[PDB]
Design a protein around this nucleic acid. Structure first.
Ligand code: MG
Ligand code: MG
Ligand code: MG
Ligand code: MG
Ligand code: MG
Ligand code: MG
Ligand code: MG
Ligand code: MG
Ligand code: MG
Lengths: 63, 124, 128, 233, 52, 225, 4
RNA sequence: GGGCCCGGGGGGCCACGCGUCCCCCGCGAGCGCACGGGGUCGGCGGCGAUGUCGGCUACCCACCCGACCCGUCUUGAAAC
RNA sequence: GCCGUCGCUGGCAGUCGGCAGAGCGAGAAAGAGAGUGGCGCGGACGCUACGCCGCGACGAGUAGGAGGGCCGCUGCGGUG
C-alpha cells in the first residue's frame, strides 16, 4: 500500500449552480461551451461566477 | 423556444416513462421513442414522424410546416407512401435531404420506415 | 425461431450467491435480506476469516453487460399494447415482459402485437 | 515493366538485414536512379434506353447495426500461417498414434501437408493404418528411421483429398420412406488404389530391416515400472 | 485510447521506434560474434592439425 | 479551384514528413555519439588504472554521482522523520525505486533512512533495463507510459532532451538538468525480488539486505525489475 | 530539391 | 587516449546530385512484407427427440479448509 | 480484467454534406486567411449536455460527518 493521506482528495469547488432555474441553466450551458472551446480566461471566470451562491455574488451599486 | 421548453419537458412530461433503468418517451412524432432533445417530436420548429398507414399497407410521413407554429390544427402535413420497400426508402430520403429538413434524422426515419414495412409483411 | 439479440457478449458475474444476513440461520425472525452489521464485537464486519461476506462495491457487474438477461437482452415491463411501439426501435437489445396483472384477453393481443413487431417476450405462454 | 527481383540482402535474422542502409543504397545503385516529377450502365429497353444502376440501395435497414472494429496487423488466417515441424520428425521416421482409433499403433511418417497435418500411413497389411492425416502434437516420434527418400508420393494426396466429406444423410422424404440408416464411408477405389501403390513401395523397404515388420505389427503399451520420462524411444 | 505498453527489450520494432541506432548496434555484435566464433573454430581446427 | 489548396496541403504534409526524417537522423546520430561517449568513459577507467599499476601507485576512481535507491520495508510502523524522507525521495511504497544524485545533503538522508532502503550504484545496463521496461513519465501529473520519443520531447524538449536516449544519457552521466529529468521520471515500481531477500531487517554488511551494496545493486535489480 |  | 582517430604519402558510412560566392588546406510515383496505436482464423472434429444437452443461482446430500453467540458497557468479551 | 471514488476545474453543440469537401496528437508563442503590384444524388453511431466520451492515481475503518439511492411504507396535487 501507499502512504498518502486522502484528507484533501475531494476538492470542494462548485461543479455547477445549485439553483434549478432554466434561464440560468442555459446561460451556464452557453458559457461552459465558451469556457472550454475558447482560450479566453474571461469566459472561465464568468462560468465560475455563475456557479457561485447568492451570497458570493453580491449586488453592485450604481455609484 | 426549443431549448427552453426542453429544459421544461426533460423531466416533467406526461409521455416520459421511467422504469427498468430505461427512459423512453411516447411523444406523437418522436422516432426512436427515446427521451432526448434531438429526437423529441414536440420541442423543435421542424420535426419528422414516420407512422404506419391507417390501413394494412403503407407508411405515412408527418412533417411539421414552418409557417403555422401556434396553430396545432394546420401545423402538420401528412403523406401516405404505399409503394415498394425501396422507392419509399428513397422518397423519405429525398424528402429529407433535398429539402434539407432536419437532416440528422434521416437514417432514423429510414430505419423506422423499414421497421414498419417489416411489421406489415405477411408474418411467418 | 428464437429472436436473437444484436450481439451476445460473454456475461461474467463476480458473484452468484445471495448476500445472506448475519445469523439468518440460527433464527427465523432474521430474514435473508442484507443488513450491514453494526455491533461492536461483531465478527462479520471485522472481515474475519471464514465468516459471512459483505456486499462491497467491488462486486459490481460489468457495465457492458449489466441488467442483461442470459438471453443477451435487457428487459422492460409492458402494461398494455401501446407500450410496445416505445420498444419497437429497441428491438434487438431489449425485451418485453407483460405485467402480472394484464388479464389473458389483453395479454393475447399483446403477445400478438409483439409477434408482428418481432419484439421478444420473456413470458409469451404466461396465462393462456 | 521491370522484371521483379528478389531481396538483394540476405536476412541474417528476422527483421534485420545483412547490409546497412548505405550498403543497400550502393548495392541497389540508387545513385543513378534519381526520379522526379462505373455504377450506371445504359441498356436498351423495348421505350428507349434505361440507365440501370448496379448495387442499388438495400430494401431493408435493421433497427441497429454493430459498429465497426479496430484494425489489427499481426493476425492472419490459418491457411496463411507458417506450419512448424519438430526436427525429431523426418520422412521415414516411425511414429506412434495416441488419440486416433489406431491407439498405440506404429506408423511410417510420409510427409507434411500444406495445412500442417502430418500425412502418415503405417503398413495397412501390418498395422491397418492407411494414408491419413494426424496432428504432430498428438503423435510420439520414435527414434527409428528408415530411408524413404526414394518414394514418389502421389501429388494428389493433398489436404483437400484427405478432407472429410459430410454424409449429408440426415433425412429426406425419399429416405424416410425407404430408410437406409445414415450411410457409411465407403472406401473409394481411388483411396484403395493409392493405398496399394504406396504399400507396394514402402513394404519392400520395411522388410529390409530385420524384425521391423513384427515391431510395427506390435502395439506400444505402458507396463508396470515403466515411466515415459525414464526411457528413450 | 490507452496504448498497450510493449517491452522495448523483447520487441525489435519498438526498440527501433525508440532508438533507431539499436538496429546497427545489433547488426554489429551479431556479425562480430559470428566472425569471432569463426575465428575460434579456425584456431580449434588448426590445433586438431597441430596436435596431429 | 481547390487545386491550389490541394498542392498546398501536400506541401504541408511533406514538410511534416521531412521535419520527422531530420529528427530521426538526429536521434540516430545522437545515440551513435552516446555509444562513443560510454565507450570512452569505460576504456579510460581502465587506462587510468593500468597507468597507475605500471608506476606502482593507485588510481582512486571518482566517487559516483548517481545512486539507485529501493524501498525494502512496509508502511506499518515508520518513524515520522523517516516517513518524511521516504516521501521526499518519492518512495511511498515498498519496492519503489528512484535515482538520486549524491552529495552531502543526500548521503545524510540515505543515512537517516538507511534501515528502510537498499541503495547502490546502478550499472549502465541496469539504467537501460530500468528506463526501457519500467519507464513512466510524470506528464500533467499523470503516470503516462513512455511509448514514444514525442512524449519526452514534448516536455523535456526545452532542455534538449528529446528521446529516450537523451534521457538515458542525462541520467547515467548526471547532467545539468538532472533534477528535472529525475522529477519527470515517475518512480519505478519493481516486483518482488525473484529468489528472495537475504534478510530484510539487517544491514547488508550484517549479512542482510538493508544499507548500501555499492557494486551489488545490479544483482538485485536484475532479479527485481 | 536535392533529389531532383 | 582525445582532437569528426589533427595533417602528408579489407570492411562499414541515417554519405553520394549539378552551379557558384566563402573561411578553414520544399509535392517522384507505385507495389507489396511486417517483432509496427490490446485477437484473429477467409481452421477444424464429435454427437444430438422418451434419453439425452444446458441451468453458476435455488432443495437435499457428500467431502477439504476456514469457522466460538449475537446486542451492550469496556483499556479489553466466546467469556465464570 | 472488472466495479467505484478522486483528479484532469479534461474532450464533444463540428451531425459545419451537390449552398458538400469531411482535418486539428503534434516536440518548439501565433492563419490548412483574404484581396493588392512584379455519369451515378450517395455517406454507421451519437447529444435524456442533470448527456456522452477519454486518461491516470487511488479503494480499511468505531464514535462522528456528508452525499447518492430507478431502496422501501402510508396518504395529497397532477399525470400514465
Ligand atoms: Mg491500496
Ligand atoms: Mg512491523
Ligand atoms: Mg521460483
Ligand atoms: Mg480447522
Ligand atoms: Mg453492555
Ligand atoms: Mg474493567
Ligand atoms: Mg461482546
Ligand atoms: Mg472466565
Ligand atoms: Mg473504505
Amino acid at each position: 500500500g501507499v502512504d498518502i493521506r486522502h484528507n484533501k482528495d475531494r476538492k470542494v469547488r462548485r461543479k455547477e449552480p445549485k439553483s434549478q432555474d432554466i434561464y440560468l441553466r442555459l446561460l451556464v450551458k452557453l458559457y461552459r461551451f465558451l469556457a472550454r472551446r475558447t482560450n479566453s480566461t474571461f469566459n472561465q471566470v464568468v462560468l465560475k461566477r455563475l456557479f457561485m451562491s447568492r451570497t458570493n455574488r453580491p449586488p453592485l451599486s450604481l455609484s | 423556444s426549443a431549448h427552453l421548453q426542453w429544459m421544461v419537458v426533460r423531466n416533467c412530461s406526461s409521455f416520459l416513462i421511467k422504469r427498468n433503468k430505461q427512459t423512453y418517451s411516447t411523444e406523437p412524432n418522436n422516432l426512436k421513442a427515446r427521451n432526448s432533445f434531438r429526437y423529441n417530436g414536440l420541442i423543435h420548429r421542424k420535426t419528422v414522424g414516420v407512422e404506419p398507414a391507417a390501413d394494412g399497407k403503407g407508411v405515412v410521413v408527418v412533417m411539421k410546416r414552418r409557417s403555422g407554429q401556434r396553430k396545432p390544427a394546420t401545423s402538420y402535413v401528412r403523406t401516405t407512401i404505399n409503394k415498394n420497400a425501396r422507392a419509399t426508402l428513397s422518397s423519405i430520403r429525398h424528402m429529407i435531404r433535398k429539402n434539407k429538413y432536419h437532416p440528422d434524422l434521416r437514417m432514423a426515419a429510414i430505419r423506422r420506415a423499414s421497421a414498419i414495412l417489416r411489421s406489415q409483411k405477411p408474418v411467418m | 425461431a428464437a429472436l436473437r439479440p444484436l450481439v451476445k457478449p460473454k456475461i461474467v458475474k463476480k458473484r452468484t450467491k445471495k448476500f445472506i444476513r448475519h445469523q439468518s440461520d440460527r433464527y427465523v425472525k432474521i430474514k435473508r435480506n442484507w443488513r450491514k452489521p453494526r455491533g461492536i464485537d461483531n465478527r462479520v464486519r471485522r472481515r474475519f476469516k471464514g465468516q459471512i461476506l459483505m456486499p462491497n462495491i467491488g462486486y459490481g457487474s460489468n457495465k457492458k453487460t449489466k441488467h442483461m438477461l442470459p438471453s443477451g437482452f435487457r428487459k422492460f415491463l409492458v402494461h398494455n399494447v401501446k407500450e410496445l411501439e416505445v420498444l419497437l426501435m429497441c428491438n434487438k437489445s431489449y425485451c418485453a415482459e407483460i405485467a402480472h396483472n394484464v388479464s389473458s384477453k389483453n395479454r393475447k393481443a399483446i403477445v400478438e402485437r409483439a409477434a408482428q413487431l418481432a419484439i421478444r417476450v420473456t413470458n409469451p405462454n404466461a396465462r393462456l | 515493366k521491370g522484371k521483379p527481383h528478389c531481396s538483394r540482402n540476405p536476412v541474417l535474422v528476422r527483421g534485420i538485414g545483412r547490409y546497412s542502409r548505405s550498403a543497400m543504397y550502393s548495392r541497389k545503385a540508387l545513385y543513378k536512379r534519381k526520379y522526379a516529377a462505373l455504377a450506371t450502365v445504359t441498356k436498351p429497353v423495348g421505350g428507349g434506353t434505361r440507365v440501370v444502376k448496379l448495387r442499388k440501395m438495400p430494401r431493408y435497414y435493421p433497427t441497429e447495426d454493430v459498429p465497426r472494429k479496430l484494425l489489427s496487423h499481426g493476425k492472419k488466417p490459418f491457411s496463411q500461417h507458417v506450419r512448424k515441424l519438430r526436427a525429431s520428425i523426418t520422412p521415414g521416421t516411425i511414429l506412434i498414434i495416441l488419440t486416433g482409433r489406431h491407439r498405440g499403433k506404429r506408423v511410417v511418417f510420409l510427409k507434411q501437408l500444406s495445412s500442417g497435418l502430418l500425412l502418415v500411413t503405417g503398413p495397412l497389411s501390418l498395422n491397418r493404418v492407411p494414408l491419413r492425416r494426424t496432428h504432430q502434437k498428438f503423435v510420439i516420434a520414435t527414434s527409428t528411421k528408415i530411408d524413404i527418400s526414394g518414394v514418389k508420393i502421389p501429388k494428389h494426396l493433398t489436404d483437400a483429398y484427405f478432407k472429410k466429406k459430410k454424409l449429408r444423410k440426415p433425412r429426406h422424404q425419399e429416405g424416410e420412406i425407404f430408410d437406409t440408416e445414415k450411410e457409411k464411408y465407403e472406401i473409394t477405389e481411388q483411396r484403395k488404389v493409392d493405398q496399394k501403390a504406396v504399400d507396394s513401395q514402402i513394404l519392400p523397404k520395411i522388410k529390409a530391416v530385420p524384425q521391423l515388420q513384427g515391431y510395427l505389427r506390435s502395439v506400444f503399451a505402458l507396463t508396470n515400472g515403466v515411466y515415459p520420462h525414464k526411457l528413450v524411444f | 485510447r490507452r496504448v498497450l505498453k510493449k517491452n522495448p527489450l523483447k520487441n525489435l520494432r519498438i526498440m527501433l521506434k525508440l532508438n533507431p541506432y539499436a538496429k546497427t548496434m545489433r547488426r554489429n555484435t551479431i556479425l562480430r560474434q559470428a566472425r569471432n566464433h569463426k575465428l575460434r573454430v579456425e584456431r580449434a581446427a588448426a590445433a586438431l592439425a597441430a596436435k596431429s | 479551384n481547390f487545386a491550389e489548396l490541394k498542392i498546398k496541403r501536400l506541401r504541408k504534409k511533406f514538410a511534416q514528413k521531412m521535419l520527422r526524417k531530420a529528427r530521426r537522423k538526429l536521434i540516430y546520430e545522437k545515440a551513435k555519439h552516446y555509444h562513443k561517449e560510454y565507450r570512452q568513459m569505460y576504456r579510460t577507467e581502465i587506462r587510468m588504472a593500468r597507468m597507475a599499476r605500471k608506476a606502482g601507485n593507485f588510481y582512486v576512481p571518482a566517487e559516483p554521482k548517481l545512486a539507485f535507491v529501493i524501498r525494502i520495508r512496509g508502511i506499518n510502523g515508520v518513524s515520522p522523520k523517516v516517513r518524511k524522507v521516504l516521501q521526499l525521495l518519492r518512495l511511498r511504497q515498498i519496492f519503489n525505486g528512484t535515482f538520486v544524485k549524491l552529495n552531502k545533503a543526500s548521503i545524510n538522508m540515505l543515512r537517516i533512512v538507511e534501515p528502510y532502503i537498499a541503495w547502490g550504484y546502478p550499472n549502465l545496463k541496469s539504467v537501460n533495463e530500468l528506463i526501457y521496461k519500467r519507464g513512466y513519465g510524470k506528464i500533467n501529473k499523470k503516470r503516462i507510459a513512455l511509448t514514444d520519443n514525442t512524449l519526452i520531447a514534448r516536455s523535456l524538449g526545452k532542455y534538449n532532451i528529446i528521446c529516450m536516449e537523451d534521457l538515458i544519457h542525462e541520467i547515467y552521466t548526471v547532467g545539468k538538468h538532472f533534477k528535472e529529468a529525475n522529477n519527470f521520471l515517475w518512480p519505478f515500481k519493481l516486483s518482488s525480488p525473484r529468489g528472495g531477500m537475504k534478510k530484510k531487517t539487517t544491514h547488508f554488511v550484517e549479512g542482510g539486505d538493508a544499507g548500501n551494496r555499492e557494486d551489488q545493486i545490479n544483482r538485485l535489480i536484475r532479479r527485481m525489475n | 530539391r536535392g533529389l531532383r
